[PDB]
């Protein structure tokens, strides 16, 4: 699964 802390600027939810 992706690491949501790899880039904090990315919000995975749509």
């Amino acid at each position: 699964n992706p690491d949501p802390n790899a880039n904090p600027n990315v919000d995975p939810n749509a």
Partner: antibody
Amino acid sequence: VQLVQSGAELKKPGASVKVSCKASGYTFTSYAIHWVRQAPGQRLEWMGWIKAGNGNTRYSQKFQGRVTITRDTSASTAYMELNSLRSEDTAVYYCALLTVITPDDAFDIWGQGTMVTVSS
Amino acid sequence: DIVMTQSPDSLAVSLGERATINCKSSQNILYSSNNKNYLAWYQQKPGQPPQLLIYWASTRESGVPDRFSGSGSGTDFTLTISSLQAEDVAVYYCHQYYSSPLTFGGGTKVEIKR
């Protein structure tokens, strides 16, 4: 939304360099500033990010013990300090708002880059 | 690291022709829970910072010309320029934000034959 970096510098081996990244045109505290190295004949190398709000950081393992990223909210500026400079550290250093993807915005901005040359 | 491998390393096409660049990730970067590919495409011209073209592997950034399109899922991704114009000569990089550290591809240099 713009990012303006400090000018090119020359440093002796073993010294330190401190590159600034002046941000404008957006809410500074809302996003993370990344730092990315572009060395000759090498692919772009992520070094770390700092959350401009609370100052939390994450560094790559390649620079963990030798880079320090900080920010100054009053001046809307992020900084990248690299210690114990090696002649192999000669590169272009970018600050960048990498892949800002929010429920309301989507943008990506890089600074113009800063040549750092390490030489005697 | 997630290794991003681009093919070919350089590409020469005539003006108005179609250019295809492949990027392969060493690890699956599709998240099944949201069906998103954590991949971006950048364009860099000499002396300039990279500029974002595509994110989520297929969503165009605002203001990017429609001739740039991204496709693929999982480990195999494609950047297409449907009809090259003279200002499209540059180095094109893929980029993953699936896991830390963020990594970039080796670049594909696109040149024009005339």
